[PDB]
């Protein structure tokens with residue numbers, strides 16, 4: 001299995017088949033506990049927990065007293081990133097017989113909705129317990145399972161309450177992608193694309209060249225696209241791990257991972273749950289690249305490559321994309337609404353709105369988000 | 382200059398009579414620079430103490446550009462506020478400001494431990510964490526709760542089950558707040574002082590026995606004697622926290638009395654206070670160490686008497702407790718059920734702090750005790 005260090009810990013392990021062959025034993029040996037709590041959603045639990053339940057019994061066969069594996073199946077989708085579902089999980093763990101205690105090892109089996117919600121549960125449970133990430137979506141493998149950011153949403157916006165809590169293990173198993181719906185694979189590509197745009201022209205170029213091939217494999221899995229798939233995923237995870245190790249708590253550099261997200265999160269607060277995170281970030285990347293162009297920092301040629309590359313992977317580049325309009329029931333994303341939502345962006349320095357600006361594909365303007373005047377933002381909205 | 386105490390490698394603790402009137406505002410402006418200061422307090426305290434500070438704040442921020450804002454939130458007093466709803470209500474109020482409070486916010490916890498625990502916990506998860514400072518206004522908060530970063534809320538099942546370790550940037554201890562503290566609350570805080578001495582200093586325990594009469598006379602109507610008992614408790618906790626911040630062993634000692642105590646408190650709150658429940662928990666956990674042959678009977682008597690000399694309850698049968706909880710009783714089964722939720726437990730193994738003598742723990746961590754042994758000291 002491939003390993004990636006983050007924050008001085010060898011916590012990322014990647015290999016096809018980890019969930020079938022490695023995770024249970026590795027939990028029993030490196031995350032020794034009497035109590036394991038597996039959190040997942042109802043779309044994937046019945047597909048993927050049966051095998052693990054069996055792997056667990058076998059791995060725990062010579063441990064005495066016998067440890068227990070307890071399972072919580074949450075509703076799928078963004079609506080589960082809420083105060084209520086966080087409380088519900090907590091209440092159920094506390095209600096176990098005996099209750100789940102400080103030795104508990106929590107296992108986030110799912111995409112970024114389950115990872116963000118479960119990692120936040122683990123961060124405050126009795127003041128904190130160990131957890132691991134088992135990313136099952138492309139988005140989670142390339143971005144959300146890595147780095148420790150956890151959160152829930154409130155009615156005002158995205159991820160406003162949460163905590164930075166690092167997982168003890170991050171198991172990346174590409175076999176999960178075999179059952180991942182087409183729209184979700186495409187949704188995840190927005191974060192892959194973003195990560196390349198903030199770090200490498202060559203990696204961005206590889207993504208452009210690979211689009212047709214990958215998309216055909218996705219809509220037809222991946223036997224014939226296996227090496228390119230692995231390389232684009234590893235390039236995203238490794239860059240993210242670099243940035244986080246240098247700036248875990250976002251005093252500067254980690255701002256860069258939020259490219260596309262100042263306008264993207266402002267759109268998402270309105271368009272969720274009908275439109276996905278990556279879809280919202282794609283429109284946010286286009287607008288924020290348009291803003292950099294407006295400010296003279298980014299070349300028009302660069303804005304066109306960003307637009308085309310997102311479109312080549314099937315992502316939306318406009319709030320008026322017809323696939324978006326078929327799903328949103330006439331929702332409005334007016335300029336005033338979007339500005340109000342951007343005042344809740346966590347990167348803001350007091351009332352100064354801070355947005356990531358690119359100076360070229362692969363190169364950020366600054367090693368942090370920049371302050372941008374409200375009037376300039378209003379132009380691209 | 383005020384007295385400073387180091388904790389976790391920084392001189393975060395600052396103590397002097399009058400700090401709130403003369404030092405805090407300026408110190409926050411220079412050392413916790415921000416555009417937005419959010420003060421959280423309870424309605425008993427706010428109207429007394431915030432007006433002076435509002436003025437001090439404006440004064441201190443006069444040369445600052447742009448001028449910073451001070452926003453205040455007054456919560457209902459008492460344990461009822463350490464809840465999921467009240468945490469969400471403060472968070473919603475912060476996010477609803479114009480403009481919203483952001484990551485630069487400096488939160489000020491002006492109050493006893495209820496306000497400290499709640500406010501600290503809000504700070505720890507707000508936008509994934511903002512700076513905060515503690516301004517302890519009760520004796521309990523000056524000698525124990527404002528120090529060390531443990532924050533939390535309760536749930537209907539028990540005490541402090543959800544929370545976080547989040548250290549304050551400053552801890553300002555101003556004895557002037559004790560001028561208005563109700564007698565019952567002063568006595569409540571003395572349980573944590575007595576506990577702190579019993580787990581680590583027979584000298585301090587002796588000083589508390591010797592000064593009880595004088596301290597209580599003053600409460601019910603010595604400054605150097607009081608200041609010394611407060612400073613001894615705080616320094617002992619700062620050493621423990623600096624050494625074992627996340628409670629891998631040594632910090633368990635600060636929970637002496639609390640395995641049984643928090644089990645009682647889950648039943649008797651909000652009518653009976655934390656210190657009051659911990660006082661009974663100290664007696665029962667001492668009896669338990671006696672039962673296990675670890676603690677001598679004479680030491681148990683000495684603990685009971687010291688608690689009573691300060692006016693704390695030493696049994697569930699205490700007449701005053703019975704008067705405030707008419708209709709509420711603590712069963713052995715309910716206590717045992719509640720102890721299963723204790724955060725020090727290792728899986729199902731209950732862990733309790735055992736003392737081998739006044740001033741000396743059996744070991745420098747909580748010890749596993751069989752369920753059938755714990756049950757024998759739980760009756761009234």
Ligand SMILES: NC(=O)c1ccc[n+]([C@@H]2O[C@H](COP(=O)([O-])OP(=O)(O)OC[C@H]3O[C@@H](n4cnc5c(N)ncnc54)[C@H](O)[C@@H]3O)[C@@H](O)[C@H]2O)c1
Pocket residue numbers: 041043044076077078081110111112113114115116136137139140143144145146147148149150158159176177179180181184187191276277
């Ligand atoms: N913490 C971070 O650093 C971070 C980074 C990026 C995005 N995010 C968050 O990520 C969330 C989006 O995550 P997501 O896109 O993974 O959503 P998700 O977890 O809801 O998963 C997407 C969908 O796919 C289903 N699914 C998941 N794995 C599957 C599999 N292997 N086979 C079949 N179906 C499967 C799910 O049930 C769900 O319907 C947002 O809430 C966003 O804010 C967080």
Ligand SMILES: NC(=O)c1ccc[n+]([C@@H]2O[C@H](COP(=O)([O-])OP(=O)(O)OC[C@H]3O[C@@H](n4cnc5c(N)ncnc54)[C@H](O)[C@@H]3O)[C@@H](O)[C@H]2O)c1
Pocket residue numbers: 423425426458459460463492493494495496497498518519521522525526527528529530531532541558559560561562563566569573654655
């Ligand atoms: N985090 C920790 O390390 C820690 C340590 C010990 C106890 N605790 C927690 O502390 C809490 C108890 O705190 P507390 O006893 O300070 O309670 P509290 O904050 O409710 O204050 C006690 C009462 O005195 C009032 N008051 C406070 N200061 C006053 C003043 N100067 N003048 C007049 N009235 C004043 C308050 O309104 C309240 O009615 C419990 O919830 C307990 O679990 C936490």
Ligand SMILES: O=C(O)[C@]1(O)C[C@H](CP(=O)(O)O)[C@@H](O)[C@H](O)C1
Pocket residue numbers: 143147149151158159191254256257258261346
């Ligand atoms: O710092 C990160 O890990 C992120 O910037 C974190 C954001 C969530 P945040 O803006 O709430 O921190 C995530 O959506 C993004 O893809 C990567």
Ligand SMILES: O=C(O)[C@]1(O)C[C@H](CP(=O)(O)O)[C@@H](O)[C@H](O)C1
Pocket residue numbers: 525529531533540541573632634635636639724
């Ligand atoms: O470690 C501490 O600071 C304490 O043990 C923390 C407890 C609360 P906890 O048992 O919820 O950690 C507090 O009541 C006690 O007086 C001191």
Ligand SMILES: [Cl-]
Pocket residue numbers: 124506
């Ligand atoms: Cl919370």
Ligand SMILES: [Zn+2]
Pocket residue numbers: 191261277281
């Ligand atoms: Zn994102």
Ligand SMILES: [Zn+2]
Pocket residue numbers: 573639655659
């Ligand atoms: Zn206590």
